[PDB]
Structures are given as C-alpha cells and as structure tokens.
Amino acid sequence: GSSGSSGTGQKPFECTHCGKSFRAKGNLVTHQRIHTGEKSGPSSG
Ligand SMILES: [Zn+2]
C-alpha cells in the first residue's frame, strides 16, 4: 500500500518494458533482468 507517487518527468534510464525508471544504467539493467525469459537464479542467501 505505497503512497502512489509516479510521473517524475524523464529519467536517464527507463524500463520501456513496464515503465520502471532509474538513476543509473546498472540499476535499471538489473531490473530488466526480471522481464527476460531466461532464468539463472542466485546461489544462496
Ligand atoms: Zn521493467
């Protein structure tokens, strides 16, 4: 139940796929990995 704050303007890195914006490329890149079909999954927690 987050406040619901969206629409900041235009970020240097956006996930056109869904619309997830980020500050740096990496941050976003890691997010996009959620869309990609392939799955690698981590090792441990
Ligand atoms: Zn996305």
Q: How many CB atoms lie within 10 A of CB 42?
A: 5
The residues, ordered by sequence, that sit 6+ positions from 28 with a Cβ below 8 Å of its Cβ are 13, 14, 15, 20, 21, 22
Which H or E element spans position 26? helix 25-32
Q: How many CB atoms lie within 10 A of CB 25?
A: 10
CA of 45 to the centre of ligand 1 (A): 24
Residue closest to 27 by CA, chosen among 35, 15, 16: 15
CA of 44 to the centre of ligand 1 (A): 24
Rounded CA separation 24/4 (Å): 22
The one-character DSSP state at 4 is -
Annotated binding-site residues for Zn(2+) read: 15, 18, 31, 35
Domains of the chain: 11-45 (3.30.160.60)
Query: Would you say 31 and 15 are in contact if contact means Cβ atoms under 8 Å apart?
Result: yes
Query: Would you say 8 and 19 are in contact if contact means Cβ atoms under 8 Å apart?
Result: no
Which H or E element spans position 14? strand 13-15
